[PDB]
């Protein structure tokens, strides 16, 4: 149930091409050879068999730069001894597991002891061990693979660490990995698609940037051997400190990440995906990057399946297919010509302007043809004459016939070329294609893909659909792939050849299609022939200028740019949507639908990401009349062409939210280090009488720059009255707005858009579709913003959370779910130069702008965000959201924490890649207690400041802060208004006498306590006093608190309204406990009396804890500690009773309710076993009063141990702290130990008492080791 590991760090030589260099464990005769090949310095992790770090275990070449692979399971432990032997210090942050702050790998605004901080930097020599828990919650879920992809690395400096090569491998399986893993089968190869950059490595001081796969560029990776007809598990771990992505294809295979078909393996910064694939073939294959930007010429490696010796249940394939139907697959009848025509990218043009964006790309002139171009399509014909065309249609131009096929069906694709050049026809995603009739190849044609059909040929292709290229019962009915030519991929693509492919399952029949294409006419074979025909001048010349190219990169929707495609669908009607992104593009498209919500991986989303050369299938229900545009979400597009609209048209209570849009002045980091800037936000208000912006506190203080929670269940209503302040006009769009069917006549473009200082109300019924699925969580996240300029005013500051809770779950008057502390995170980049309010930001007197880039979570930077505080064993529901441009592909990570997400199934994650626009919900429950960090794991974001700390605390650490005994010293107490000789220091609870509390005649009085340190606070015990007969006290009061000097804010916890009114005492002697679930974090705290009785008098005590939650009852009183762990030197044993050492529990009662030594003397003692190693901050002692004989211990020393024979007494100042104890039977006495001690066995020795030695106890402590 434990495993042992050893490891260090070493600097060496590495080249990215030739192997055999990663074996410097025995010196070789290779030093003369200092010739191109190219070499740098790189540093990595190195394994060692033993504990003296000299026996260097060898490694295989397929790993490459990967640190030694590490394994564990549930109910386990992991003991790893790191030792830096290189130059720079290294750490060891981990993901997926469980550690105790003594093992993190990063130091931040943690307010923690430095003993728990040396793990944050391991420096050369030395050692420093770590240990990880892999506890209950970290285990894998059901529909999860047998094992899960996680990792580790040094976190001392992210930008330099990952680019110097500090990285490793760390899978974690469940109880079920001990089995003899079939050594000639499973194999389980580990891959790293890392982007490396020596230009900001550790050691470097215009350097080269590199796309490697485990460290190998240009098809240089050996060692990849998997068996024949048996699958293999891909443990992919994307890196790259730069953002960017890698749409990764395997030459002739698909993938089985999760439960859906995947041609591409779309990775992004720090992804953690586990694919599976079947190796049905023999021979050698390639795995390359299919990005249009061929800087990625390195992301290519070699794969060879081979034969083996002699299918055990290891998630044996699950795409089961057989017979639940009736009819047979039909051989299909298709005739396709690749002939030539001319194309208008906007047959509905207009406006011959100049300043227009639609002039460069479209307006025909004497030197820019803009509008019409000569291309080459895939035309559909009815027979073999190829001289009668199948009815071509609008709303699917420039493209070829729809090509449909079930599993096992047959497609007879007959191809005739009627063009000036040889073109091909070839499908994607399908793994089975050969000529009809024959099996074998032409002449020297190693693979049919890139074989040209001559201008006149007639070739008979036979496509057949297997299963290992289709659905899984999980994904939608018909995944989407493409077909076109292959003899010149990029150019044939830009020439005009394109066509659709569909693979369905049985158990306008299939509707219309959409291709998002960047048609690069500038590489068409009909470039030098498009001039000689269309342009009025020949010797144009001088085209090397970068706006002749941007005069015809026709950013098109199908074959139509600038609102030229106008398809039509009625109301209520249901439409599948097969979407694709093929073209130049280079990157991914964040497509969206104005006022429409669609279903993706059987989940509901607002925006859908589209990788290059990636088919994604969706479907949406049409129940929103009007006229709706499309879009791209990714910046300079749309402007440049990509539009097309839709013209839909026809053929218990309610929750009220008064919202406006004001403009504050924001500063992201007053901490650390300052200019203050001007943005525009939303704020919850009170009335249309817009005077009282409802104050956001406690439950809404993490929000900061975000708009307010607008909560709503399903089947109720959502009224959004929205008045607009500000200067420029903005709006309120949701994609959940559902205007009723109004104004027939013709389809009207939806108005929205309110001029400043004007009001518009929104009122729509929440439908079931906006709600979360039965399979989903309790409350799905939705986006909402302003639709006036969805890019600029989004960098200005208008965004918020629209939450749709499900069923009768958002209860009470509070309008929250209350069973869960729910938070919202917003990972994006802010660039003030696009803001509407940037001109006025010349805030100085009288040139690179790199400090206007704010990598800001919720608008904070470098731990500056406060308001993240969650209960211990509570379930928390996080909401991650990414927006902006395509740089925002954030890898969200909670320091050491693991979370769960639901998309049809419930999987498990530690880092989330937040693709922009998509809004997904996650949940988690935290175990370890303290303050942790929330980061975006992208290297160049942590140092740019994208980070904030979040505290989890103890819900059962209540210790008197010190008002009583005097732990709270006398100078800490202050107040204004004091009447006369009723001093604020007399406010100590249970203190009577002549004068005995603190009063004040004055009206607006208060009283201040300084805790000297940022302390956690868990409640206030409020009393009063008596002057002869009149009971005086506080009947009603409210709370103030601060943190540094004068950032004072009120207490509005547990919603209620404006702020929480506390109820005071009622009598003199009577005590009142005003707890608060939502606790306070402060050090200065003031109380304000609102309704006294005669005079504001007060006798009090504060209930609190330290910032790391160490003052916990371990289990003495609550009987969580077993008696077999509680003994002594003896025990008063006889017949009247027995005072067993197991009877000395604080507050434990009985006729024999204590421990008593059989002989009284200053030698006796009592001992406690913990069976593990724990931390202790104090003891609490308590005597007993049997009969009329009071029995307690007046003084006691304390000694500690790790074993059971050797003891080290508790010292202080110079000698041993004689802890003074009880003076009565009842009242317990705390003695907070200082310093705290890490221990396993604890002893207590008396030195003096009363009558006879007797005691009950409870130990303030906390978990550790």
């Amino acid at each position, epitope marked *: 149930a434990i495993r042992r590991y050893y490891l260090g760090a070493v600097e060496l030589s590495w080249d990215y091409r030739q192997s055999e260099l990663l074996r410097e464990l025995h010196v070789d005769t290779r030093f003369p050879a200092t010739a191109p090949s190219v070499l740098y310095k790189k540093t990595v992790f190195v394994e060692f068999t033993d504990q003296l770090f000299s026996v260097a275990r060898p490694r295989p070449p397929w790993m490459g730069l990967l640190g030694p692979t590490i394994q564990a399971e549930v109910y386990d432990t992991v003991v790893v001894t790191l030792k830096n032997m290189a130059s720079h210090p290294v750490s060891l942050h981990a993901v997926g597991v469980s550690f105790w702050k003594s093992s993190e790998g990063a130091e931040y605004e943690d307010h923690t002891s430095q003993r728990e901080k040396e793990d944050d930097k391991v420096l050369p020599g030395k050692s420093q061990t770590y240990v990880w828990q892999v506890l209950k919650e970290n285990g894998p879920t059901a529909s999860d693979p047998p094992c899960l992809t996680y990792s580790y690395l040094s976190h001392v400096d992210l930008v330099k660490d990952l680019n110097s090569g500090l990285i490793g491998a760390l899978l974690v399986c469940r109880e079920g990995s001990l089995t003899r893993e079939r050594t000639q089968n499973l194999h389980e190869f580990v891959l790293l698609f890392a982007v490396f950059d020596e230009g900001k490595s550790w050691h470097s001081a215009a350097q080269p940037a590199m796309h490697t796969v485990n460290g190998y560029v240009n098809r240089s990776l050996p060692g990849l051997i998997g068996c024949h007809k048996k699958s293999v598990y891909w443990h992919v771990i994307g890196m790259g400190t730069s953002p960017e992505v890698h749409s990764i294809f395997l030459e002739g295979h698909t993938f089985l990440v999760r439960h859906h078909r995947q041609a591409s393996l779309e990775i992004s910064p720090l992804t953690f995906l586990t694919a599976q694939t079947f190796l049905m073939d023999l021979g050698q294959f390639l795995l390359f990057c299919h990005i249009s930007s061929h800087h990625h010429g390195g992301m290519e490696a070699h794969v060879r399946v081979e034969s083996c010796a002699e299918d055990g249940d290891d998630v044996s394939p699950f795409i089961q297919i057989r017979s639940v139907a009736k009819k047979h697959p039909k051989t299909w009848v298709h005739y396709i010509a690749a002939e030539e025509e001319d194309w208008d990218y906007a047959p509905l043009v207009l406006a011959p302007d100049d300043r227009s964006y639609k002039s460069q790309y479209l307006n025909n002139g004497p030197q820019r043809i803009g509008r019409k171009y000569k291309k080459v399509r895939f035309m559909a014909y009815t027979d073999e004459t190829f001289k009668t065309r199948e009815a071509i249609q609008h709303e699917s131009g420039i493209l070829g016939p729809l090509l449909y096929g079930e599993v096992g069906d047959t497609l007879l694709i007959i191809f005739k070329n009627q063009a000036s050049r040889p073109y091909n026809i070839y499908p994607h995603g399908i793994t089975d294609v050969r000529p009809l009739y024959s099996r074998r190849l032409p002449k020297g044609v190693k693979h049919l893909k890139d074989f040209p059909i001559l201008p006149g040929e007639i070739f008979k292709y036979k496509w057949t659909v297997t299963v290992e290229d289709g659905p899984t019962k999980s994904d939608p009915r018909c995944l989407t792939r493409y077909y076109s030519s292959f003899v010149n991929m990029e150019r044939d693509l830009a020439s005009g050849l394109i066509g659709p492919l569909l693979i369905c399952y049985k158990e306008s029949d299939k509707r219309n299609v959409i291709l998002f294409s960047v048609f690069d006419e500038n590489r068409s074979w009909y470039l030098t022939e498009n001039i000689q025909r269309f342009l009025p001048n020949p010797a144009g010349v001088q085209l090397e200028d970068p706006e002749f190219q941007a005069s015809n990169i026709m950013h098109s929707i199908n074959g139509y740019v600038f609102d030229s495609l106008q398809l039509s669908v009625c109301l209520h009607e249901v439409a599948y949507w097969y979407i694709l992104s093929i073209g130049a593009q280079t990157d991914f498209l964040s497509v969206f639908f104005s006022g429409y919500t669609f279903k993706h991986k059987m989940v509901y989303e607002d925006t859908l990401t589209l990788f290059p050369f990636s088919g994604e299938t969706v479907f949406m229900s049409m129940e929103n009349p009007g006229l709706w545009i499309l879009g791209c979400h990714n910046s300079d597009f749309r402007n440049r062409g990509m539009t097309a609209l839709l013209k839909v048209s026809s053929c218990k209570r309610t929750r009220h939210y008064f919202i406006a849009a004001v403009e504050q002045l924001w500063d992201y980091g007053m901490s650390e280090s300052v200019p203050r800037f001007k943005k525009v936000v939303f704020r919850e208000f*009170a*009335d249309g*009488s817009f*005077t*009282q912006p409802s104050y956001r506190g406690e439950l809404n203080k993490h929000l900061g720059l975000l708009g307010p929670y607008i909560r709503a269940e399903v089947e109720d209503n959502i009224m959004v009255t929205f008045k607009n302040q500000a200067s420029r006009p903005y709006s309120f769009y949701s994609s959940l707005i559902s205007y009723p069917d109004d104004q027939e006549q013709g389809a009207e473009p939806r108005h929205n858009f309110v001029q400043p200082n004007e009001t518009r109300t929104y009122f729509w019924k929440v439908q079931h579709h906006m709600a979360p699925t039965e399979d989903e969580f309790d409350c799905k996240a939705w986006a909402y913003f302003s639709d006036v300029d969805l890019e600029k005013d989004v960098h200005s500051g208008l965004i918020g959370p629209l939450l749709i809770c499900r069923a009768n779950t958002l209860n009470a008057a509070h309008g929250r779910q209350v069973t869960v502390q729910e938070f919202a995170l917003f990972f994006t980049i802010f660039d003030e130069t696009k803001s509407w309010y940037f001109t006025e930001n010349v805030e100085r007197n009288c040139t690179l702008k790199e400090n206007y880039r704010f990598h800001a979570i919720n608008g904070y930077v470098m731990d500056t965000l406060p308001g993240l505080v969650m209960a211990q064993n509570q379930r928390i529901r996080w909401y991650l959201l990414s927006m902006g441009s395509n740089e925002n592909i954030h890898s969200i990570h909670f320091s050491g924490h693991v979370f769960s997400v639901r998309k049809k199934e419930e999987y498990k994650m530690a880092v989330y890649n937040l693709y922009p626009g998509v809004f997904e919900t996650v949940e988690m429950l935290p175990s370890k207690v303290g303050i942790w960090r929330i980061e975006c794991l992208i290297g160049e974001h942590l140092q740019a400041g994208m980070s904030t700390t979040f505290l989890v605390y103890s819900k059962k650490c209540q210790t008197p802060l010190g008002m009583a005994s005097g732990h709270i010293r006398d100078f800490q107490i202050t107040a*204004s208004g004091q009447y006369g000789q009723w001093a604020p220091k007399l406010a100590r609870l249970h203190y009577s006498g002549s004068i005995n509390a603190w009063s004040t*005649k*004055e*009206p*607006f009085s*208060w009283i201040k306590v300084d805790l000297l340190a940022p302390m956690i606070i868990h409640g206030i015990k409020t009393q009063g006093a008596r002057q002869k007969f009149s009971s005086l006290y506080i009947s009603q009061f*409210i709370i*103030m608190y601060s943190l540094d000097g*004068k950032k*004072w804010q*009120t207490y509005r916890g547990n919603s209620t*309204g*404006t*702020l929480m009114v506390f109820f005071g005492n009622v009598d003199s002697s009577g005590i009142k406990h005003n707890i608060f679930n939502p606790p306070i974090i402060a050090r200065y705290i*003031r109380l*304000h009396p*609102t*309704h*006294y009785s005669i*005079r504001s008098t007060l006798r009090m005590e504060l209930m609190g804890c330290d910032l790391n939650s160490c003052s916990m009852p371990l289990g003495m009183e609550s009987k969580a500690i077993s008696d077999a762990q509680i003994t002594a030197s003896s025990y008063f044993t006889n017949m009247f009773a027995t005072w067993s050492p197991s009877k000395a529990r604080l507050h434990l009662q009985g006729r024999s309710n204590a421990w008593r030594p059989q002989v009284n003397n200053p030698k006796e003692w009592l001992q406690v076993d913990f069976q593990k190693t724990m931390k202790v901050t104090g003891v609490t002692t308590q005597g007993v009063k049997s009969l009329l004989t009071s029995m307690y211990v007046k003084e006691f020393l304390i000694s500690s141990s790790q074993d059971g024979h050797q003891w080290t007494l508790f010292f202080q100042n110079g000698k041993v702290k004689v802890f003074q104890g009880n003076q009565d039977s009842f009242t317990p006495v705390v003695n907070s130990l200082d310093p705290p001690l890490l221990t396993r066995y604890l002893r207590i020795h008396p030195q003096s008492w009363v009558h006879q030695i007797a005691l009950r106890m409870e130990v303030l402590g906390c978990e550790a080791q």
Partner: antibody
């Protein structure tokens, strides 16, 4: 603990006039401060306030373009430097406090000042 | 814009008669305050936080409420406490005080 203001002045339609408001016997810098307008008729009309921790005042709506609120940390006092004194500025101007924290109200007052519109 | 209306204007009281005066306001508030001007004097704090009384007021006074209509009740009025009364609020900006209110015994 009192607010000792200055005695009233006398000006002509549209000039410059500076008052005062010396403190009591406490830490003046911590506390806030308002000025009040009280015409020979209406109950009250608010003028504004100033967070006198380091000096960052505000204004009301009725009154704009022809007033001022300054500071003197030395003698613990606030000022009201009214420019472009129109004729109907004829009312009693006061001094407030609100306390040091939650919901700013009023604590003490003082003597007045008003010599408008004077011929 | 935060308007407070004082109700009534000036009433004819009686030396020992349960008399109350409201102060309803368009914009609704949480906490209310009152002040007495003793015939154009430097005004005085009388009720603070909705209902409780300040130090230095004959206990014959009270009054309370919440939201859109507050009140100021007096049990036994006496010619001593016969002056002018304004209500003033603090929930926004500006803090427009009430109109007018007076006592005649």
């Amino acid at each position: 603990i009192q607010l000792v203001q200055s005695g009233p002045e006398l000006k002509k339609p549209g000039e410059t006039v500076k008052i005062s408001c010396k403190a009591s016997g406490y830490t003046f810098t911590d506390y806030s401060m308002h000025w009040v307008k009280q015409a020979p008729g209406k109950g009250l009309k608010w003028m504004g306030w100033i967070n006198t921790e380091t000096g960052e005042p505000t204004y009301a709506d009725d009154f704009k373009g022809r007033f001022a609120f300054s500071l003197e940390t030395s003698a613990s006092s606030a000022y009201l430097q009214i420019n472009n004194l129109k004729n109907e500025d004829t009312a009693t101007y006061f001094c407030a406090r609100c306390g040091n924290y939650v919901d700013y109200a009023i604590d003490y007052w003082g003597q007045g000042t008003s010599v408008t519109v004077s011929s | 814009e935060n308007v407070l209306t004082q109700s009534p204007a000036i009433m004819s009281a009686s030396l020992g008669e349960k008399v109350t005066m409201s102060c309803r306001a368009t914009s609704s508030v949480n906490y209310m305050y009152w002040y007495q001007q003793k015939s154009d004097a430097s005004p005085k704090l009388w009720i603070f936080f909705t209902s409780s009384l300040a130090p230095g007021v004959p206990a014959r006074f009270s009054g309370s409420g919440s939201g859109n209509s507050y009140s100021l009740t007096i049990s036994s009025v006496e010619g001593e406490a016969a002056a002018t009364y304004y209500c003033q609020q603090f929930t926004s900006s500006p803090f427009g005080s009430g109109t007018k209110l007076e006592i005649k015994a």
